[PDB]
Structure formats: structure tokens, C-alpha cells
Design a protein around this nucleic acid. Structure first.
Lengths: 79, 104, 91, 97, 98, 83, 106, 92
DNA sequence: ATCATTTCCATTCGAAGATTCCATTCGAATCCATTCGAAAATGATTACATTCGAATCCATTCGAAGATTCCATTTGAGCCTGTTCGAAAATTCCATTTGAGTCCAACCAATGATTCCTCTCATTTCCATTCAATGATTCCATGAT
DNA sequence: ATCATGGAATCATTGAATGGAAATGAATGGAATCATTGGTTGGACTCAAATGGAATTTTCGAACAGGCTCAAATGGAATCTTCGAATGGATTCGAATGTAATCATTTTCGAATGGATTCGAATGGAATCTTCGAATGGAAATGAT
């Protein structure tokens, strides 16, 4: 039940940074799904990079390469 | 004399030539190519550093932080589109509220 | 073991001489240079290939910058590259 | 007794979080979620702390973007409340779905 | 006299054009439009006929895609009629704009 | 030559309608047609600029189907069938 | 004697040529002898899958010959090819007949 | 001066799968486009893998991690299988 | 618009810590010289794009009937948000363990280069058969009554 | 409910177009032989990533009150679909133009390479300073009259 650790107030804070005045009650679980799918697709790709380097540590560069592949290029962690 | 000097550049023409040769882009790299490339790189670094700096002192601060880079990137049209698909770690968002959510 | 930090800092001092950079903002700057490098270099490589030529010249880098950079950024960058190349030859 | 009217503390929350850059999910739960998810792909792995920071930066940036587009969909429907139907339209138009 | 009700010939046209693959813009108008635009970019160009055909395939495919998303936007607004606000919402979320 | 001007009006209202039908559209507000002409106009400009950039780079005066294909891939709208 | 590597790998696709394109395309200075074998395998596999589904759709349209409409039906009705070609356009593919429920008459 | 395509091979595989069906010139051009596209996607991603790992060679292991990254799900597993089997058949 | 508790915002102070200024070093760029090819060039040679008017076909649009969808409005539920308040659990700290990841060094194994040639694959004309253009055809969903 | 209308899906018909075949040309992959080094293996070692357990700062939450949004239902205004058909525009086709692209054999340049050295950029480790975190009232909304 770790997806429940992303609490309702944290989802609402993200929604406020996003400009949202009012949040329906079914949003919170729906967000919890989408976040999880996001983490799956990146972390799968990150882990593939780690496996190819025959490493046991997922590195920030693996994360960055995954994100780049996913169309979500990230600046600030080495690429 | 380094090629950066003979081109008037702060950015490293030699190193850019080596990354070009060593990056599997083509069998052979003319000597004009790292010059013109390192030029473009120094230029864009400078444009971003100017607008970011501006935001850094209009935000009352001495040191450029990612927030200032993010304000610079997103409030400028052509940098924004050039970095459309890029995420600045610790950038935040720039304040915008949909009018219809405002009171009154 | 490599970065672009000394040059980013040099140019920063050139443009805004009394302001500094945070560590992580410098990380943003380094990531930015490497991203833009890779976009230019990549597109130039493709242009070489499409035209059945084995060498990447400044003309490839130029067409690359026109394809990759929007509008006024393209125009300024093309100029400052052409001026670095003529200045480099005559010097 | 005095209580603000519904919607005001929301507008002020919008002002406060659009003015700042801190990560909004508390960090230990997100680390737990990351390690769990990664386990199902390869066992058993470790992480540079900077890798978890990269993931969390990317996650929050994605979610804030998605709430932007979701909110435009709510407004497009003449509502002020984001509903799952809004998220689903945003994601289908983005081509994530 | 016989008159179909509004919406009937529309639905039958949807069925008719979703079953077919022929280009839906007439060919000469589209070609002139291509030469005008390209001329405003560089002068004294010619075109392989297959280049205009590529352009027109890419264009109709892009616009049909866009009308799918526009239509999802009308329906999201409880409407059956696509409006410019629908198109603009599609293009902003697609990230082609704003 | 002759002068090319106002050719976006040659994309007629019925053809925007046909494109709308293949896309599943039952009913079209009257302001759609000029908006469609707007978007088409941007689309072709952004494709054609890049294609012409490839053709100029090839020191050529004829735009080739490959130049269009490269531009479209570059633009994120990869096309099969001329390849 | 002379027998081609495509035969030694059991392939319809040309391992030699995939090897020459690999060397001649600037992906790296050197191409192991295993990489073109495995690539030509993946390409032949995906060609086989597409042609499989296209042939099926051509045989429900009662025709002998695969046409782009048929490739397009195959791609868009298969979930995973659809995603593989999410951002691709089949010239002369058309679209999938789909009418939003709420536009049907009542 | 002469050009290359994959037509003979696409046509061979077509005969294997659907032995009495034909393919039009445009459908073949679509197929050629598909092979060249996927070739470029695999080769590109593998090249990236070699560079990322400080290696000068693209081995069959590169092509394989490439295929894992680029193809969805069941397509990946089948394709990795078909490739690994061609490679062992090729060496031993 | 009226005065009134919130809270935001600014302010001014002090140290906590992050930048950067600098000593050191060793690895990378320069130099300088040379082989050899990729790129540039001209010139003869297609060829296919542009243009022509004529004929023919196909699609457009102008303007009006009235169908019906969009929107403005009320109005009543149901479901949001905001006030604590207790309270768990995230955080911070620090200190330990130790496994992974790295780094050379000696070494093995596999990839280039190349020359000759043979086997394949590209292209061409040749021809067989699928696709299509059209025409009447019955079928059928829609619309009037 | 019944039946007429008109569009569509279905009948081969009669031939144009498009393929899948057959014949060979020229070029490329295979073959067979290597310096050549990138990959690998191993033995030694350092860095970073739990782990852990305790305080600690702090979020989180369940639960209610009542605001206010959302949804359903309602009426008429206005806007959009359908309709016929003259005709403007496109499509077609046959052809002549001429211009740019492409194949070809000539070298002009330019970039590879590699050895030997200076100089530069990485790194670490010390101070200079900015930033951050306070506590503390003042403008400022923002809710109640």
C-alpha cells in the first residue's frame, strides 16, 4: 500500500501548483494511477539501462536516459 | 594560441572538435565545424545567462538559481519553444491563474 | 571528469559581471549545453548522411542550427557562428 | 468565529505553490513507492540518492503539467472542478492514451 | 417532396469518408497553396510531384487527426458542434501552442 | 511567372467538411472553416520551411519527396510511403 | 563453396546488408558479427507480424492484394503495433471507422 | 545509378505467412518505409547504449537492449526470442 | 463602500553554509608535418517539371426553408472546502557496516582491411490477371402519412 | 404502426492498369588471411548506500458545517443542415520547353595521424560572503455588517 503514501494533501498541493481551484474527490485515486504508470514506464527503462551496464545500482544517469527516451528530458542531474 | 582565441570564444573549440570526432556523427570533421558550433553554444549560454541574471536581481538576489533560469526560459518565447520538452530541476512554474477562477 | 562550467562562468562574468550561479543552476547550464550540442551534432550528422557526404563542415552546423533553432535565435546564432568562422580563418 | 469563504484559501494555495519550487510530495513515501515499483522489474536493486531525486523531480513536473491541462478541460466544460473525466481527456489528447 | 433530417446525411458522410482513403482536398488548390508558401520562403523552386503528394498526405492526415481531438472536445463540453474553442483546446493540450 | 496570392482560400469549405467527416465530426460551427484554414496554413509553413532548408542545403532548386519526408520526420510527423 | 550468412542464421532478411548499413551509418566504429544477425531477425519478425495482420484484413475485404488501407487496419487494430507506430502516418491508410456514440440518432 | 530496398525480403516473408496474397507497389513502399524506420530506431538506440557505456562496438547485446527499450511488451519478448535464436544458429 | 482578524509581506538582524577564489597537477589540445582521398568542377547528357490550350468532368456555392442544437436560467441536491485537534510518521541526525563499483595490468579474442570473384539482387521488357469503371439491380434505412 | 423515396450495397461486365515473371547485368557480399586493439579478466581497493534507532519537527486526518458548485430541466433564439444546378474550377491529355539533376573523369584542397610538449581544466580545500531563518509590526485582503 505504498501508493497510499502519496497522500491526499500532496496530490492537492501538486494540483495547486498547477492552478486548480477545486478538486473532485475521485481525482485522488485517479492521480494515484497516473503517477504509478508514470513511475512504471520510466523505472522500467531506467532499470534496463542498469542491466545493460551490468550494474546493481540504478544511477541518476540511468534515470536521465530513461526520461530522455520517454520524451521528458530532465536538466540538472548530469545530462 | 588556442582556436578559441583565434575565433574569439569563451567556449572550447578544441574540446568541441574532439567530441565531434569521438561522437560517431560522421567519418570526418572539418575545422570550421567546431568553431561555428562552439560559437552557437556560447551564444545561447549567454542569452540564457542574460535573461536569467535579469530575473535574479529583479528577484532581489545575487546568485542565479534554477528558479531564475526557469523564469527566463518560460517568459521568453523562443527559449520556451526551444526548451518546450525540457524540465528544469527545481524550476517551479511561472505564476498564472485562470481568470474564471478569480473572485468577484 | 568534464564539464562546461569554466566557460559558462566566463560567459556569465562577460554578460552579468556582478552576479553568480548556484551549484544546481550551474548543473542546469551544463545539462543545457550538452543537450543543445547533441541536437546540433545529431541533425548535422543526418544532413551529411542524406547528402552522401562523409564530412561534417560548418555548412552542416549552419543548416542544423536553422532546422533546430526558432526564428530570431536561429538568425542571431547563424550570425555569431559565421563571424566566429571568418574571424577564425583570418586569425 | 470567522472563517474564509470557500475558494479563497484555495486561491491563496495556488499563489503560494506557484511562487515556490520545493518538491510537494514528502520524500520517504515516494522513495518507498520507487523501490517497490523497481523491484517488480529487477531484484534487488539500489539507487543513487540523486536518482530518486531525478525521478521525483520528473514525477512532480509531469503531474503539475497534467493538472494544468486537466484544469483547462474542466474550464472548457464550464466547470471549476477537475474531474477524472478531465484528466482522461487531457491524457487522450496528449496521446498518452 | 423528400428531405432528409439534419444530421442524417452528415452521419452517412462520416460513414462514407471513414471507409475511404482518397485525398479529400482537391489537388490543384492544394498545389498552388504549396507553391505560394514555399515561394514566400525561397524563390525559383520547383517540386517533384511526389513532394506535393507527400505534403498533401501529411496535411490531410494531420487535419483529420486534429478534428478527432476537436470533436472529443466539443463532446466534453456537452456539445455536438465543433467550435474554434474546441480546436484551440486540442492544440494547446497537444502542445502545438500556448 | 504569375503572382501567387490568397491561395488558402482555394481549400474550400466543402473540403474542410470532408476532412471533418473522416475525423468523426457531425456538426461544424461556421467559424471553424477560417480557423481550419489558419491551422493548415501554419502546418504547411512549418513543414515547408524545413523541407526548403533541406533542399537549399543540397544546393538544389527542386524540392524532392525525400526533402518533405525528412522535414516531416524532423517535425515529429513521420510519413510512410515515400520513405 | 559459398553460402550466405542469412542462411547460416536461418533468415529471409539479408544479414550482410544489415551489417553494411550498420558499419556505414555511423552508429559506432565497429560492428560485432552478432549484431547484424540479431537485427535482421527483429526486422524480419516485425515484417512478418505486420504482413500477418495486413493479409488478414485484406482477406476480409475480399481482395488478393495488400494495399495501404490494409496495413493501416492491421496497425491500428493491433494494440502494440499501434503504439510502435503511434507517431507515424500510412500514406493512403485512412482511419478506423469509429463514430462517437452520442452522435448516433435516438 | 542504382537503388536498394527490402522488397524481395518483404515479399519472401509475405509468401511464408499468407501464401496466396499479393502486395501493391504502394503497400510495398509502406513496408520499405517501416523496415528503414525500425532499422534506424534500433541502430540509433544501440549506438546510444555503446556510447553511454564507453564502448566502441555495437554487439548483439546492444541490439537486444535496444529492442527491449523500443518495442512494447509481447512484441519485445517475441522479437528478442527470434533474434537470440538466429544468433545461436549463426555461431554454433 | 464600512470597520475588523486574519494573513502576506517586509524588515532587520545573525550564522549556516554554499561559492569561489586559489594551489596543485596531469591529461588534453597544439604543433607540426605528411599521406590520400573526399570534395569540387565542368561538361556532355538526359528527363521530368512546367506550361499550353482544348476538351470534359466534377464540385462548388448561392440563397432559402425550418429543424434542432446551444445557451441562459432557475433551483434543488450533493459534495465540495475550511476550521481545529490529535496525532502518526516523515525528518533529522549520526554512526556504523560493507558491496558494489572502480581501477589498472596483463591477456585473450574478435573485428578491421582487402583482394579476387561469384552469386545476388536491381531493372527491364513481357504478359497474365486483378482491380475498376459503369450499369442496372434488388435491398434497405429513412421519412411522409 | 404502413409505404414511398433514394442511397447503398450487390450483379457481373469487358478492359485498363498493375502486378509477379522471366532474362541478364553489374555490383556487392563472401572468402580467406591478419596486425591490432578493444574487450575481458582479475586482484586491490575506495566510495557511497543502506541500516539503524532515536528524538524531533511536522505533517496528516477524521469529522462536521453550510456554501456553492453541478446537474437536470426548461424555453426560444439563432444557427447550421439539406436542397437543387448553373457554372466556375478542376481534371485530363497531349506536347513542347529547357533546365536542373545526374553520371562521368579530371585534381584541387583539406583533414587524418602521430609523436612530444606546454598549457589548461579538474579538484580539492580554505574564506568570503550570500542566503536563509528567525522574530516583529504594517499594509492588505477579505468577511462581516
Amino acid at each position: 500500500d505504498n501508493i497510499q503514501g502519496i497522500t491526499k494533501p500532496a496530490i492537492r498541493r501538486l494540483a495547486r501548483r498547477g492552478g486548480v481551484k477545486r478538486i473532485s474527490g475521485l481525482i485522488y485515486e485517479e492521480t494515484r494511477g497516473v503517477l504509478k504508470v508514470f513511475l512504471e514506464n520510466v523505472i522500467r527503462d531506467a532499470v534496463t539501462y542498469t542491466e545493460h551496464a551490468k550494474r546493481k545500482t540504478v544511477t541518476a544517469m540511468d534515470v536521465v536516459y530513461a526520461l530522455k527516451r520517454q520524451g521528458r528530458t530532465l536538466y540538472g542531474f548530469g545530462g | 594560441k588556442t582556436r578559441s582565441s583565434r575565433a574569439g570564444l569563451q567556449f572550447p573549440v578544441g574540446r568541441v572538435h574532439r567530441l565531434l570526432r569521438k561522437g560517431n556523427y560522421s567519418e570526418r570533421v572539418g575545422a570550421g565545424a567546431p568553431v561555428y558550433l562552439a560559437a552557437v553554444l556560447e551564444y545561447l549560454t549567454a542569452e540564457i545567462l542574460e535573461l536569467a541574471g535579469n530575473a535574479a536581481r529583479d528577484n532581489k538576489k545575487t546568485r542565479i538559481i534554477p528558479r531564475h533560469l526557469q523564469l527566463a526560459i518560460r517568459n521568453d518565447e523562443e527559449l520556451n519553444k526551444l526548451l518546450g520538452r525540457v524540465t528544469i530541476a527545481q524550476g517551479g512554474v511561472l505564476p498564472n491563474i485562470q481568470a474564471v477562477l478569480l473572485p468577484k | 571528469k568534464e564539464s562546461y562550467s569554466i566557460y559558462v562562468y566566463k560567459v556569465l562574468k562577460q554578460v552579468h559581471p556582478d552576479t553568480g550561479i548556484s551549484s544546481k543552476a550551474m548543473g542546469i547550464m551544463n545539462s543545457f549545453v550538452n543537450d543543445i550540442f547533441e541536437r546540433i551534432a545529431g541533425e548535422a550528422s543526418r544532413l551529411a548522411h542524406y547528402n552522401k557526404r562523409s564530412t561534417i563542415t560548418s555548412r552542416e552546423i549552419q543548416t542544423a542550427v536553422r532546422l533546430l533553432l526558432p526564428g530570431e535565435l536561429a538568425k542571431h546564432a547563424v550570425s555569431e557562428g559565421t563571424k566566429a568562422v571568418t574571424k577564425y580563418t583570418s586569425a | 468565529p470567522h472563517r474564509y469563504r470557500p475558494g479563497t484559501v484555495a486561491l491563496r494555495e495556488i499563489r503560494r505553490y506557484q511562487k515556490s519550487t520545493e518538491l510537494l510530495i514528502r520524500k520517504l513515501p515516494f522513495q518507498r513507492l520507487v523501490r517497490e515499483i523497481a523491484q517488480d522489474f529487477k531484484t534487488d536493486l539500489r539507487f543513487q540518492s540523486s536518482a530518486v531525486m531525478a525521478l521525483q523531480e520528473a514525477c512532480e513536473a509531469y503531474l503539475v503539467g497534467l493538472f494544468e491541462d486537466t484544469n483547462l478541460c474542466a474550464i472548457h466544460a464550464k466547470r471549476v472542478t477537475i474531474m477524472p473525466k478531465d484528466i482522461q481527456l487531457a491524457r487522450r489528447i496528449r496521446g498518452e492514451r
